[PDB]
């Protein structure tokens, strides 16, 4: 019973400009997820740092599954992210050879 709301790297309805505040100046493989710019289908947007730029990868949501491209194979956003911590996004696009290495946490350090 994992909830996306508890994910360190899930920042909800923040904007791309707000994401850039968190990803600017970071290392390759730094990442967070926000809601997509539009609510259609309940998609999400992964933002991943590479080469000093922010790469945005749509997380499609269809029929209760999630993925970057068809076929959608993941049962939750958390499961998707956990997969790409270990497997490079070269699986999505051969030219995007980066893993999800450094989550940007929304929580205070306490």
């Amino acid at each position: 019973n994992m909830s996306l709301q508890d994910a360190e790297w899930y920042w909800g309805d923040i904007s791309r400009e707000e994401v850039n505040e968190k990803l600017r100046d970071t290392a390759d493989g730094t990442f967070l997820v926000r809601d997509a710019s539009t609510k259609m289908h309940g998609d999400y947007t992964l933002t991943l740092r590479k080469g000093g730029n922010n790469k945005l990868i749509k997380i499609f949501h269809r029929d209760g599954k999630y993925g970057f491209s068809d076929p959608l194979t993941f049962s939750s956003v958390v499961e998707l992210i956990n997969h790409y911590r270990n497997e490079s996004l070269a699986q999505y696009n051969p030219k995007l050879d980066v893993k999800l290495l450094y989550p940007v946490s929304k929580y205070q350090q306490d």
């Binding site: 730029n53 922010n54 030219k95 995007l96």
Partner: peptide
């Protein structure tokens, strides 16, 4: 720059 990444080349 913020860029969407597509699945084609």
């Amino acid at each position: 720059k913020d860029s969407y990444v597509g699945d084609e080349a």
